[PDB]
Ligand binder design. Sequence first.
Ligand SMILES: CC(C)c1n[nH]c(Cl)c1-c1ccnc(Nc2ccc(N3CCNCC3)cn2)n1
Length: 261
Amino acid sequence: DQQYECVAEIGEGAGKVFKARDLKNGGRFVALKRVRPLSTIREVAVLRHLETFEHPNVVRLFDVCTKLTLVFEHVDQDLTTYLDKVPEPGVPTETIKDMMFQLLRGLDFLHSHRVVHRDLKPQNILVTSSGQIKLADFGLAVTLWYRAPEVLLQSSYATPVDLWSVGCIFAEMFRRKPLFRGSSDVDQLGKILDVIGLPGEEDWPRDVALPRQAFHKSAQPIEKFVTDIDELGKDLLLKCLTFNPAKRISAYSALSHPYFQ
Ligand SMILES: CC(C)c1n[nH]c(Cl)c1-c1ccnc(Nc2ccc(N3CCNCC3)cn2)n1
């Protein structure tokens, strides 16, 4: 509108997003998303609705302009930039524990309200100037490195999908480099099972193009790929990376794990 001025282009991908000046509000930076049905009306309704709770761990939605313009609070950087710029030998064991918790709270908040992010990844996990985690880019219908097994197999899309991503990110906090870096759904599923090993035959979803036989792999020691992690972080991380989504830990169960005590 005539109340916002675009200064740059933050990101673009699956309209796009800009960094803008909130002229009416002290010229603060904001994030303008210009999207381009009833389902959309409803997704927007959901966003407006979740906004009312102003969960500390999700980006504030400052306004919706009547194709569609959504105005969100701006955060200087994302988790990737944060990991890129983090000084050796990495991220403070305790900074990890903290961010992860904040990550799980925002996630449980969405799950409690039955929203499934579906594309959780460092690029849409924003770290604020005060070290606070804020989720963005969800609620509105390139990299499979964070995709969950079921998504890849194309069988279920429940909320467990995001916990898988969380574990994938939890590892990367330490690694500072992606855990499962595949180049195709099959390749991706391949590298995953290389590490967690083949799941029981009954843990394999029924009626999916890819059969368990399509792969050939044993459970490798996790601390091998994730160095510094403790006994507790190891347990939790595994509980997140369980092949069967029905056995995968929930953000809510996660918020209580010993690791956070
Ligand atoms: C996750 C991004 C793409 C996003 N999608 N939808 C909305 Cl809404 C936002 C959003 C909201 C608030 N703040 C930022 N902040 C931000 C994030 C990344 C970057 N960058 C720029 C430098 N290269 C890495 C990416 C700059 N600002 N983004």
